[PDB]
Amino acid sequence: VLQPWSDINLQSFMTQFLQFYSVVEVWTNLWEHVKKQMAPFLEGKSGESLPADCPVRSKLTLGLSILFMVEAAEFTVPKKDLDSLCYLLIPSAGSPEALHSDLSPVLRIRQRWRIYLTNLCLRCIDERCDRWLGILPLLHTCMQKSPPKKNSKSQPEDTWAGLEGISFSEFRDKAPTRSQPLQFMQSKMALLRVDEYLFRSWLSVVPLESLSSYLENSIDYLSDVPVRVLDCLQGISYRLPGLRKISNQNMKKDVENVFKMLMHLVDIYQHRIFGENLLQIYLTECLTLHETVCNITANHQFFEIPALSAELICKLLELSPPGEKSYEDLVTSTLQEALATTRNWLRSLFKSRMLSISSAYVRLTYSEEMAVWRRLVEIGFPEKHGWKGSLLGDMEGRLKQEPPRLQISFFCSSQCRDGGLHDSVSRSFEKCVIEAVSSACQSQTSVLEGLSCQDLQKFGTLLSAVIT
Amino acid sequence: SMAASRRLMKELEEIRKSGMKNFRNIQVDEANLLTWQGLIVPDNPPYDKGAFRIEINFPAEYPFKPPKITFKTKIYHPNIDEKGQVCLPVISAENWKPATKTDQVIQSLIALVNDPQPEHPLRADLAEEYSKDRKKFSKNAEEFTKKYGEKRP
Amino acid sequence: FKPESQFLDTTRLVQSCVQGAVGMLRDQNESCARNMRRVTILLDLLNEDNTRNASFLRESKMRLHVLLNKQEENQVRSLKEWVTREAANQDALQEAGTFRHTLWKRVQDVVTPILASMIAHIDRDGNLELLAQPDSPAWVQDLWMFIYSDIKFLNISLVSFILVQSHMNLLKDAYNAVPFSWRIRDYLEELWVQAQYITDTEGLSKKFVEIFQKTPLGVFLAQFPVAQQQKLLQSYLKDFLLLTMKVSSREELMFLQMALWSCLRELQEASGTPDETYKFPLSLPWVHLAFQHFRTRLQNFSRILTIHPQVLSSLSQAAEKHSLAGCEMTLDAFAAMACAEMLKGDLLKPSPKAWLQLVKNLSTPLELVCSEGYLCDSGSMTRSVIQEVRALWNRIFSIALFVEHVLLGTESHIPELSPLVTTYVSLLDKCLEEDSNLKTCRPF
Amino acid sequence: PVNMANAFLPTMPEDTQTGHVLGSPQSSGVAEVSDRGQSPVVFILTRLLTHLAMLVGATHNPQALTVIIKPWVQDPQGFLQQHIQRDLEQLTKMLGRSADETIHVVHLILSSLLRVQSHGVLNFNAELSTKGCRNNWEKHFETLLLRELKHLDKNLPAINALISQDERISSNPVTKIIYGDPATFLPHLPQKSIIHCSKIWSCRRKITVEYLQHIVEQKNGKETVPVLWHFLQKEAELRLVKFLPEILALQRDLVKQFQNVSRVEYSSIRGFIHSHSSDGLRKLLHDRITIFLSTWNALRRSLETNGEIKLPKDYCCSDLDLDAEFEVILPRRQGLGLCGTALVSYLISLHNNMVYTVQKFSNEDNSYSVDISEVADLHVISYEVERDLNPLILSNCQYQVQQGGETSQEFDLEKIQRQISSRFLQGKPRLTLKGIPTLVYRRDWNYEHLFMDIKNKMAQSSLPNLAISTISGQLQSYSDACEALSIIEITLGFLSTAGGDPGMDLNVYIEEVLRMCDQTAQVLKAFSRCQLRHIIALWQFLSAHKSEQRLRLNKELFREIDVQYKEELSTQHQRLLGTFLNEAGLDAFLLELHEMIVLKLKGPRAANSFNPNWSLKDTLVSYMETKDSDILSEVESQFPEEILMSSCISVWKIAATRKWDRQSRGG
């Protein structure tokens, strides 16, 4: 009766099945009967190759029919039947969206089938989860288009992915013993042309360690449309604040890899990504990403991730083509906010003094500190704004907190090496050194007695300071 | 806003008690003071044979936004179109000031009616007619006033 | 406002900003401006003494926190550092005096418009009066708290002088007897729409009541005593009357109240004995069902009350003389009967043209009520009642035709035949009593 | 046609709108109802003759008609041929006769308007340059068309017989069995029968609503049956009235869910319809928006002509679809949201006009009136023409026969009038605009409406001198002044939208009536001796006080106003202001000045009319007549005229500093 595929035939099918179930061990025999209908499609048959006695020709139609049957029965299904059923809902050979919109009038009514698909997804929550990912295309072909709003303004990640009924938090945060999603990704990669929500709903579910791979093997996809980088950033800044403090090397390298591929994918194509006055949303998104990534590092050794975030903001500002004064106000505001966020982060995570001696062999309490200061100032920002009159001032103020004599002793204690060929932090160090020498020589206490200070350039600077 | 309409009420009272002897039969609806209707009665020829009905609408931003004056009676002027719109420099947005009371506007527009200005016309052809042959303009305006002009009070 | 700090005294802050919040609300210049009543109501139930007040404080703080968190993500995070922004604000720092007074003032300014919008979305038509009312049964407070703790059920949005609209154009201190009227009305409209579209018109009532029992509101309401649900029932019925139908009267309010109750009772008796949906006969959605089954026979009835208010006075005794609203609806028929009696009573007044007008304004409702298909199914006694009502309506309709033709003509053209036509109309009226069916031979 | 550049063309709707603005012929809109004062048949005849006129003009020179007709730029030939096809279709649908006979009748009209040589068309512009001459020419055209149309039925059989006698189509066998000749010449025919006669098997016309319009306008129905004429004049638009309740429910739901300003992020209508959590609501709203868009498309042709609310033409130019923008359906009153509001306004206006005319014709009195807050399904006129109107109108077409033998069609207007009146049109009350759903957009922060509300509710009076002295001495600090300003502004907002007692001084009001707890006791001591009946005055004083305090120290006193008003005064103007301050009520003057400045000099878009070249006297006397009634002559006759409004906060600075010198250096 289900043939041909129409709303009237679907309604008659549902009524007839309801009457059949009302009138008529029974469902065991029914399932054993439906398995013989299932098998030919699993053997790859479709269309003419299907058995002549098969009452259903299309496969999504029989998938919907069996979904209706299992919904009106409230029973369980064997695990081997999950792969067989989920193979039947993938819209294979349905790459254009025109055929999806042509099949939509046969499936007009919207939310009851949403309910059945949700309970199918929750019923396939079992530990097979192999052919599940093909249902989201149908779960989004009858859903709203991509909302152009900002992160965390509209609503949480559930509606951005378009699911709103599946909790993927436990899968992204567990022991990854099932690597099947990656191979399925490289198997059915050409699906995402059918609709747009699939990129978001798929970035939501991919684990952290495989997100870099999922990112750089979509180079052709991002060349087809230079606007899904927005959604990649949306996903990253959605999942980032939820993840807590990173204290490990696995997450360290995973985030390094994904950020590195992010810079690659942003850089290679063109400035054309930032067309149609889309720079504002990109700036807001990169600011939120920087804010989220800065608040999850409190180990003084994961500075490189904020470094790449700062470099991302740098390159995003650099590729902006000149145009009104609104853009200049926007860029001043975003630079000020970035510097404020970095300043607050370095205020928060570094709770201790500096170069406490404690051993007559004075050494830094936060030894991996100078590299952090160098790395998070070397990025390029416009000189009309701060980032040079503010963070260098932070260096000056931090170094004016230490006693002149102890700081001078540490200044060439075989730690502050590697003169960076007019490094700005090196110039700040020389300035605070000459001020400390001036203060020490202003008092009547001897300053140089035991310097094991074989580096000669800073001996020269010290001598020039003491004479002058 | 009614804050404005209070000042228009004061203006109407003072103009009615003072009298103008040339702008008669003023009427207004009390539920909406922002629309005045009046009858221009000129004194100088060739416009001494009829009177002309006018309507002045006051924007809610009055006294500050200048009122807009339209002519409800067809009149043969080089300065007023068939739509009735009239350009008065004392009311133009770039020359408006709040102290300009409605009686000064009425006096200025009546004086302009009695003595047209061709250098800034709204009907170019009538300006050319006045400039190149005064007699033709005289007969045309007199005939227009005769055929379409309202009955004098 | 995050639950489990002592970094601020939130109750003190809300008592300080309630006045400023309520000061910015604007009614429509005559719609029972109750600003002083609102602020007093809030400040006598924003305390920590009673258990209901403590739970209300917790729920209101939760609402304030969620609204503030939703509105904070719009900021550029330079406003998230409120302390730093306000400190760098020399103007307000030297305006409010000491630095902590300045910080408290900035918190007051930030919070007051959100609280104003919250009060606008809470006191839609006097919903605070129910919490203010003493000795109110437990159901009022319980549904108020259930609605107040459900952000998804009641979305409160924020916008500057904000306007509050009167849904019912309520009279002087009407204070609709259900906590949130428009909210449940719209939610039940949506639920009925979903039921009516999911299934066809064969099992609509069962699916509607089942899907109302599926919502958390239904399962929460199911635990109340039967008497409390009954009180809820007539309160909901009267406020539904007020919201859907405007009425310039209080007696007619109770009259259509009884009419809709009798319609609900008749709809309950439409099914023989399903004994599954009959387990919940005293429920809210039934009222909606009644409307969507009997809308015509309600609205037409309202017409009879609006065109000719005088009939109401007659009806004020008719309910006493016949005990209407027992099993089904006959109240529009009673209004028609009393109206017909008064029409034959006054008859040719000093202005018989006015009599023509007051019979012809009301012809169409009595034509519509006396129609087939108008009553899908009812008892045999109502069949006899409707038979005699069409009989009398056709009788007085022929009388009205006779009047509006001959009495109009003689008074308009030749005033010399009135004493004869006034007796001949009486003769034809008295000769048609026994046979109220003109299709037969003898009446013609 | 070159001489007809932007000339007043006839047979066009008037709201001037010169030109040839007409929609695409392939539209589902109105039936092109007649204009204000012309019969529709004469209107259509004149319109088709004029259409042929510009068709000939365009074929002579296409560019002239391209520059005359506004919308299209491609070609006039197809557009005009589609107009002519639609005109002939409407002609053959309206006239009750064969299409060949309708072409015969139009040819007869064209030939009959040729022998009317008697000239009485005088006093009209040949260039159609004035509306009066256009109406005059239309009046002559109506007169001649009536004179020609009143004598056409006596020539149709004769012309048919003469044309059928043409001895070149007479050889064609078709015209014998078609154009009025017996078909008995065919040998393959049944024998002569009393039922198979030629006239019994003859064609007859069909009854249609347009033919009803024709019959009621040709019989002078204005004085006998005007109700039917008014009903069929706008029957096309009232055919959409049945959809009023659900679209009103749409406006109600949109207002209820989105009582917000500048908070909607939805861009497409499809997104809204498809972003709802209920499928029943989803498909309901789908059907409802489909009906809304169909009614909008069918009715976007008379709103810009007779609708009470003026609208730009940028909304009725593009057809609405499921993927259209979002703001069209929002019931707003400013722009692009006025579509549905104006549509429902026109629907209510036509309903009210019809019920009013019907009452003024027959009822003469009715008290049955209702708002839009209880609109039901049957309350509005709801009928289907194919099932309701057609049978009720066709039931009253009597046939009359004579002894000689003839079949005449006659209409009893009383019968059909009583039929249609006693079914739908009677029992409809007078709808009022009180309860129309509408989103609120603007704000009342400007603080003047608050002051006039205070003056309406309460009889405001001046502040006591002792009270003002005590509050001035009590509020000498700046923080106290700011707290007093905040509290008094809160109470001002409270009093603007609520009542109060003119007595009941502010202290007891604050302490318990709104139950505002104690912040500082000093402001309470200040409020101890001020009444509510001076509250607005108190505000202004205290406001000025605050800014005066900002003048006393070295802090910037505005920090918000535009830089175009922040400049110093000239030397001569300083001397003039000093000589003014020499003798004047400086306290009141500075109070009024600060009341002015802080309200409207707010920075950007403060120069909409406030051009910085005016004088203080002019603007002060322009303001002072609004709500205040303070001392007058001291600024009318003494204040200098050459003050250069641009630098007017400088005048306030000078006045405040001189007042400081008065108060402090004096004592």
Author numbering:
A (entry chain A): 512 to 535, 557 to 855, 863 to 1007
B (entry chain B): 0 to 152
C (entry chain A): 3426 to 3429, 3472 to 3626, 3637 to 3921
D (entry chain A): 4418 to 4432, 4499 to 5150
Please give sentences taken from the publication describing this entry:
The giant E3 ubiquitin ligase RNF213 is a conserved component of mammalian cell-autonomous immunity, limiting the replication of bacteria, viruses and parasites.
As prior data (RING domain independence and activity with UBE2L328) suggested RNF213 could be a transthiolating E3 (i.e. covalently receives Ub from E2~Ub onto an active site cysteine), we used an activity-based probe (ABP) based on an E2~Ub conjugate, specific for this class of E3 mechanism. The probe structurally mimics E2~Ub but is chemically modified to undergo irreversible covalent labeling of an E3’s active site cysteine during transthiolation. Based on previous biochemical and proteomics data, we used the E2 UBE2L3 to generate the ABP and appended a biotin tag to enable detection (biotin-ABP). The 3.5 Å structure, revealed that UBE2L3 is bound via a well-defined interface formed between the C-terminal domain (CTD) of RNF213 and the L1/L2 loops and H1 helix of UBE2L3. As nucleotides were absent from sites AAA3 and AAA4 in our RNF213-E2-Ub structure, we postulated that RNF213 might have reverted to an inactive conformation during sample processing, rendering our structure a covalently linked “footprint” of the activated transthiolation intermediate. To explore this possibility, we generated a second cryo-EM structure where the ATPγS-stimulated ABP labeling reaction was applied directly to cryo-EM grids. Modest structural changes were evident (RMSD = 2.66 Å) in the AAA core and new density at the AAA3 and AAA4 sites allowed modeling of ADP. However, there remained no clear density for the RZ domain nor Ub and no apparent basis for activation of transthiolation.
